């Protein structure tokens, strides 16, 4: 708890002690951390509500929840399901969640993959590169019990680690003052 409500309240960038929405001439950034959360809300906005999954704990994480956290990272990658077949979905990478939509009905679903983690909720994520493949990425949830990791295919060899660097980025800073570990958001 950092009194920053439970969105705001991940040192990544927001305290109410440091972290550019402090309480200083950078908490002027938070409204752009509102604009941060606003191409999120827009990210919310086309987002189906309905079309989720079941994420690290077995959960259904929506729409509602995306809402609240931090847009920190935004690409899209290919997503190899049970059969092999790949969506180029748009990653979201947020403070609490990692997030893959699917592009359907002029705007976005969860992309759920009915049994990888199409949404690995963030600190304490394992992200791990590839062998099989030179710009593939495993966005994995082995943190808990069993991930069934989903095949993470970036834009370029080198974007691979350019996404595995960013929960390298966020969640080591989540990491920072936070606890350790954190299901279903």
Known sequence: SMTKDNEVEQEDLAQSLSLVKDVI???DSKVASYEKKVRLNEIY?????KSIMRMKSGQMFAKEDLKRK???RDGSVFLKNAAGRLKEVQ?????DILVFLQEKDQKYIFASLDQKSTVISLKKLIVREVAHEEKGLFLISMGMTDPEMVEVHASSKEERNS???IIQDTINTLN????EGIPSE
């Open 25 to 27: 001439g950078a908490v």
């Open 45 to 49: 906005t086309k987002t189906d509500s």
């Open 70 to 72: 931090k847009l920190v």
């Open 91 to 95: 990653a979201v990478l947020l403070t």
């Open 163 to 165: 996404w595995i660097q």
């Open 176 to 179: 920072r003052d936070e606890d």
